[PDB]
Amino acid sequence: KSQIPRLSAINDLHKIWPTVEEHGAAIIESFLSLDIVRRLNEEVDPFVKIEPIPAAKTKDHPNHVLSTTTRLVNVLAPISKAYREDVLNSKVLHRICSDAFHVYGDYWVLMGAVMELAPSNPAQPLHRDMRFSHPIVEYLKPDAPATSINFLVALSPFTAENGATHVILGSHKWQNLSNVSMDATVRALMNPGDALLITDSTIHCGGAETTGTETRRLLTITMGISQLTPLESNLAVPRPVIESLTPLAQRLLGWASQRSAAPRDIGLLTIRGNSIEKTMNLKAEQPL
Amino acid sequence: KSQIPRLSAINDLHKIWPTVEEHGAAIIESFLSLDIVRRLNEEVDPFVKIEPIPAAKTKDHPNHVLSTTTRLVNVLAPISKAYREDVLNSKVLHRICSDAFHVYGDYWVLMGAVMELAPSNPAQPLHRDMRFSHPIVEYLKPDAPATSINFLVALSPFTAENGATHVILGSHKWQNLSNVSMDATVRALMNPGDALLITDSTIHCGGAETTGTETRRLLTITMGISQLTPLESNLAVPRPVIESLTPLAQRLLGWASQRSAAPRDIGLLTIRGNSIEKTMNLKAEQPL
Ligand SMILES: O=C(O)CCC(=O)C(=O)O
Numbered sequence: 299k300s301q302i303p304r305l306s307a308i309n310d311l312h313k314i315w316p317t318v319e320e321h322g323a324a325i326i327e328s329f330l331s332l333d334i335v336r337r338l339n340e341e342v343d344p345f346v347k348i349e350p351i352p353a354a355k356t357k358d359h360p361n362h363v364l365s366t367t368t369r370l371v372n373v374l375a376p377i378s379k380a381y382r383e384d385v386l387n388s389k390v391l392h393r394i395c396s397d398a399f400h401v402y403g404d405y406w407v408l409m410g411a412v413m414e415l416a417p418s419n420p421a422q423p424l425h426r427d428m429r430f431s432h433p434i435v436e437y438l439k440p441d442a443p444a445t446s447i448n449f450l451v452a453l454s455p456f457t458a459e460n461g462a463t464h465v466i467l468g469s470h471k472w473q474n475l476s477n478v479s480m481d482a483t484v485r486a487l488m489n490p491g492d493a494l495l496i497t498d499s500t501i502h503c504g505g506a507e508t509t510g511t512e513t514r515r516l517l518t519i520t521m522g523i524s525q526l527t528p529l530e531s532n533l534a535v536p537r538p539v540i541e542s543l544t545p546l547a548q549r550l551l552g553w554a555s556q557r558s559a560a561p562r563d564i565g566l567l568t569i570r571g572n573s574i575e576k577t578m579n580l581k582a583e584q585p586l
Numbered sequence: 587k588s589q590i591p592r593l594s595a596i597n598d599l600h601k602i603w604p605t606v607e608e609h610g611a612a613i614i615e616s617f618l619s620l621d622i623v624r625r626l627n628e629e630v631d632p633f634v635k636i637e638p639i640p641a642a643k644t645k646d647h648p649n650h651v652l653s654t655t656t657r658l659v660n661v662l663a664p665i666s667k668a669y670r671e672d673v674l675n676s677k678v679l680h681r682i683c684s685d686a687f688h689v690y691g692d693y694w695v696l697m698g699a700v701m702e703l704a705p706s707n708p709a710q711p712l713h714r715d716m717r718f719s720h721p722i723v724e725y726l727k728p729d730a731p732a733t734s735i736n737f738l739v740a741l742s743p744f745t746a747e748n749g750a751t752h753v754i755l756g757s758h759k760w761q762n763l764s765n766v767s768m769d770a771t772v773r774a775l776m777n778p779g780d781a782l783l784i785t786d787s788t789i790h791c792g793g794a795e796t797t798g799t800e801t802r803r804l805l806t807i808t809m810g811i812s813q814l815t816p817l818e819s820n821l822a823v824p825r826p827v828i829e830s831l832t833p834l835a836q837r838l839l840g841w842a843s844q845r846s847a848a849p850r851d852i853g854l855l856t857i858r859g860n861s862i863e864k865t866m867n868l869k870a871e872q873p874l
Pocket residue numbers: 422427450461462463464502503504505516
């Protein structure tokens with residue numbers, strides 16, 4: 299069977315979204331440089347270590363879906379300089395997203411999270427994303443353009459043996475889900491910095507960690523239209539941090555009003571005809 | 587032709603949503619008491635007077651749709667004690683919304699706005715709401731449960747001559763829109779405090795002000811699922827005001843995390859497994 303299409307972030311930028319639109323998946327080679335992967339890893343390292351189990355009883359909003367061998371940490375902006383500056387302003391990310399979401403309008407981050415899988419982490423069931431947070435998406439028409447996409451960035455090597463992600467190519471167009479089998483999958487073998495890009499309709503799953511020794515880590519960036527509510531909030535991020543960001547990064551984190559693609563768009567998160575950033579005189583690019 | 591069903595907020599509460607589900611519209615008599623209408627009016631009065639034209643060039647997010655004879659003021663929580671306390675905690679509103687949105691999960695205010703129409707304000711074109719802000723809704727399946735509803739509360743008398751709202755009964759179920767005519771409409775004749783409730787699929791329009799003397803005013807409350815982004819932001823509302831509200835009112839204004847109806851819901855606007863209100867130790871019901 300055919301493998302996931304591989305593309306250059308450098309030479310094939312315009313080809314990335316068309317490829318996903320057709321096959322439901324693509325691997326973007328060197329989506330993040332090794333320098334950014336390295337800095338990102340240093341910055342999130344301690345936060346993944348302290349993270350309790352997904353359904354820890356201390357939690358207000360426990361995650362009962364992820365395995366006990368999974369650690370997920372989100373709201374990455376206050377944690378990671380590399381995240382807030384390099385990845386939130388990614389030229390490649392923003393081209394793909396504008397290609398993807400132009401029919402709808404503005405987009406933002408629904409969730410940016412580092413996921414680390416412990417040795418012997420079992421495979422996830424084959425699934426589509428967004429079903430534990432946005433029931434609305436199941437009521438969209440089959441042909442509606444994707445309202446969210448997910449960049450699964452490798453922060454350590456993805457191998458067949460250490461649980462590299464599985465995808466079913468073309469599955470984003472499936473309606474009848476009775477050929478859903480692991481038999482129909484191909485793997486996303488990736489070096490750190492490579493990214494598997496999928497849509498919210500692409501059938502996929504994290505793979506089984508078989509070695510009992512390797513730890514797999516990824517940065518999952520779910521980008522979605524500004525008409526959908528993010529899974530995470532940046533409301534509690536200190537203002538000096540927010541004010542250190544670019545206007546674009548501020549918008550991505552819900553610290554700006556948003557716009558739809560309606561010809562006479564009246565806007566989202568406005569305040570009596572004016573933006574959030576104007577009203578609160580939110581500054582931008584003020585270093586710490 | 588058949589008139590818009592009229593219901594008591596007191597005796598027919600359980601019948602309100604079933605009625606709208608069937609006919610696409612219903613009039614809730616005495617939705618707000620005259621006391622609340624009176625206080626609401628006193629509190630918003632000066633803010634409607636100072637409001638410029640919808641597309642005023644000073645505005646960051648101008649509204650190019652509404653007439654120049656329309657004044658709309660939103661983000662009502664800091665303006666109106668009656669709004670933030672009485673209407674945001676409305677027993678009748680919350681029963682209807684939970685009846686309406688239980689399939690999806692939590693709901694919140696997409697926009698609470700006072701609209702005042704000047705004498706001789708022309709009729710609006712027949713329309714469905716949400717099309718200038720949420721293109722996503724047009725891509726929902728025809729039978730998807732409504733993801734937003736609109737309470738059109740009279741703050742002054744609605745008469746045939748002063749431009750009472752028109753609705754086409756049953757139009758929320760229409761797909762083919764070629765019988766859209768003013769010939770197919772009925773009026774929402776209302777006393778102050780009565781509310782016309784419609785869905786985001788109900789075909790309707792503000793009526794023509796014919797007297798050249800009367801000013802018509804309304805409180806439009808668009809309640810919608812927490813998975814959809816509000817048209818307005820409460821991000822800039824002073825914290826003593828937010829902390830004066832009930833937990834429920836805080837949620838409605840985006841000052842709390844939200845939950846979907848997914849059996850293993852992972853939540854919306856969360857912060858590493860915990861709520862906004864916990865993280866920011868947001869207090870509640872602290873009077874001013
Ligand atoms: O672990 C992976 O490679 C995929 C993770 C995933 O699909 C998810 O957690 O939703």
